[PDB]
């Protein structure tokens, strides 16, 4: 019994019910089995966890829970009360019981309590009743678990949910010590690896945490999360997680990009990873690179399907619209918007060539630069081309989710191509807005120009 | 007969029908009068300008146009055939006609042909039949104007639609020459100012362009457009156009932020500015306009679209609601294309006179820093407060439109405070991703 699927766990605009239903169809299609409801800014999940669902809301939520059952996806309802629950006070404990009970009555059999991204410091009243913050959480968590009839699936997300968040370290943490000791064994605990966005999740590090928490965790994976940087998007493949974790884990629920349709590779390649060693115990079963090609290939079919005879002569202007998206276009796009700690090859290459051309620009040995520049201008040409043919695609829902990303990168690669062309011879200037002005002081018939568009 | 309202002419996710209908409500409330439908990436407005609306599509357009009549908004339908049209071919010219006909059958009196953001180079067969790009645009704009029986309102957007785009100069341009000449006089012309995004539109520039087009232009104003920078939003006020423009102009159609709910101030202050001097041949103040607009907007925050703690117990996270100081700071952080708001620049200026003077913590010029610093750590806490209060607001529709901008600025000020707290003692290294890494290597 391995929970593998998607947690809608992120900050910002939640996915709508139509998307969540489509999400279940995709998980089924790819042999995943689990959905964790936890949109940080779906107001009744956290901010207003207390408030019960309206009549309209309840219909929508029942239908969804129903849709989950229909597609064989475990539906896990989470609630996030740590911002302002008074744990000691039993009327609050009663509200939590009421909220969850309404949902169970919507058909939900699986639940979670999430205590991530909250202050550690308690209120007077709670300290008089609880030794530690961890004590309080484990108290209601166990109370709720028991009150809901000890369900096959109940999840707990610690406030110390990655390596860096443990004081003073993972293995000697008072918080986790208490959770591992006091939290009923039937409950599962979520973990996001060594950091919030773990590059790698080494088996050594799961071994460690499993000991302090006295059970195998469910990964809450933020490899493909993009809520924390307006400019970023992650289309690279699942990576940095050995198939040798599978037997040493209870599950992996990925918390992907906000833009629903950008998560084809993200969920696809997680399914490939899971399925590659589904029944392992304890020869390379999982290749990120292969899994990526495998998913981009599948994804590509979606671009020619809608939302969800005039040829011009040899002397007439050709259809802008003619050429459709290619695998090569998506292979490039994915390399440009790859993973949080790594660009795809085609993307790194470009940066490495530009870095070089900019260094050796002085030369004005010179048939090298003319030649390298050329090859770079050509690459820049494929980015624009890629943007151009995406812009034309029939699946306008996919385009709309990605538009602002691809517009950005094509527009920047354009200024860069300009800048190389000029080495061999508007508000693109306040760029980044104020956020960027602050950020740049922290430590780390002529063809036109100032064509903004 | 002054066209003032809004054009949906930006790149990316078009607005949906519900939002368009609510726009007409707001335009009518604020006594503006026009809507120009020109979403760059609505497939059938441009990329696929030749394709007829489906039946489902048509009913939605009919219902929308009807909604405009009922809110007393003039609905202008634009189409954009620049990228692929063989202007010389009359099968092509027919295709355009059959398509503008379908739209008039939905109840549309008013039209536009847009030739913005295309390459100024015609195909072989087109170059035989026309002498210059302008001639060809004008020929079909003229033929279409007429066919439709000289609609009261019919617009033309020139390829050369701002100062800087005109080869070689505004007043000396062969393209504008042909336009002001051969384009029939009933047809109105769109113009964005000196630049694409224009910081100012001087009278002299309008008088100048007026002369070469031989008519008073309609401004397509891109002041609050935000489709050209992922991280930018413009909540600042209409500015850099004098009330003295108005009688020199047939209209102003603002083309505002992609995010629908962010365009409250951007449209409301335009409204104020038109009211200021509806007829004529000082009166309009940016800052006062903004305050009226922000003070109206805040009402929308508290309305959609319990338990009380003992002082022993944990206070409601949700209690304090969004204030007009919050919106005032927010707008200053996300002001205008060429200028940050007062409270925005203040915070930047301080952080730059906190970084320079930082090795002064390594006795009269220490008491300065440590104070100026904590007066800035506090100003940072004003940003992170406005976020948490916004993120608690009842109107989630507005929150979601703003969310990621708001999350960004608070994230950065959180880190910039961390820095100031440290200069006085995880993924942020690939900040901005690849595009980011390239932007840092440019000048």
Numbering used by the authors:
A (entry chain B): 59 to 340, 371 to 396, 537 to 592, 603 to 663, 677 to 695, 707 to 715
B (entry chain A): 59 to 339, 372 to 395, 537 to 593, 601 to 663, 677 to 694
Quote the authors verbatim.
Human O-linked β-N-acetylglucosaminidase (hOGA) is one of the two enzymes involved in nuclear and cytoplasmic protein O-GlcNAcylation, an essential post-translational modification. The enzyme catalyzes the hydrolysis of the GlcNAc-O-(Ser/Thr) glycosidic bonds via anchimeric assistance through the 2-acetamido group of the GlcNAc sugar. OGA is a multidomain enzyme comprising a nonfunctional acetyltransferase domain, a glycoside hydrolase domain that belongs to CAZy family 84 (GH84), and a structurally important stalk domain involved in dimerization. GH84 enzymes operate via anchimeric assistance by the 2-acetamido group of the GlcNAc sugar of the substrate.15−20 The reaction mechanism involves two distinct chemical steps (named “cyclization” and “ring opening”, respectively), leading to hydrolysis with retention of configuration at the anomeric center.
Here we report a crystal structure of wild type hOGA in complex with a nonhydrolyzable glycopeptide substrate in which the peptide is S-GlcNAcylated at a cysteine residue. Crystals of WT hOGA, protein produced by coexpression of the glycoside hydrolase domain (residues 11–396) and the stalk domain (535–715),11 were seeded with a known peptide substrate derived from casein kinase II (CKII) (339-YPGGSTPVSSANMM-352) and the corresponding CKII-Cys-GlcNAc glycopeptide. This peptide was produced by S-GlcNAcylation using OGT. Crystals of WT hOGA and the CKII-Cys-GlcNAc complex diffracted to a resolution of 2.5 Å. The resulting hOGA-CKII-Cys-GlcNAc structure shows density at the active site, corresponding to GlcNAc-Cys. GlcNAc was bound in a 1,4B/1S3 conformation, with several interactions between the GlcNAc moiety and hOGA residues, from N2, O7, O3, O4, and O6 of GlcNAc, to D174, N280, K98, G67, N313, and D285 that have been previously characterized.11 The peptide could be partially built into the active site of one monomer. Surprisingly, only two of the 14 residues of the peptide could be modeled, Cys347 and Ser348, and no interactions were observed between the CKII peptide and the active site residues of hOGA. Such weak interactions between the CKII peptide and hOGA could allow for flexibility and accommodation of the vast range of known protein targets within the active site. In summary, the results of both X-ray crystallography and QM/MM simulations reported are consistent with hOGA using a preactivated 1,4B/1S3 conformation for catalysis.
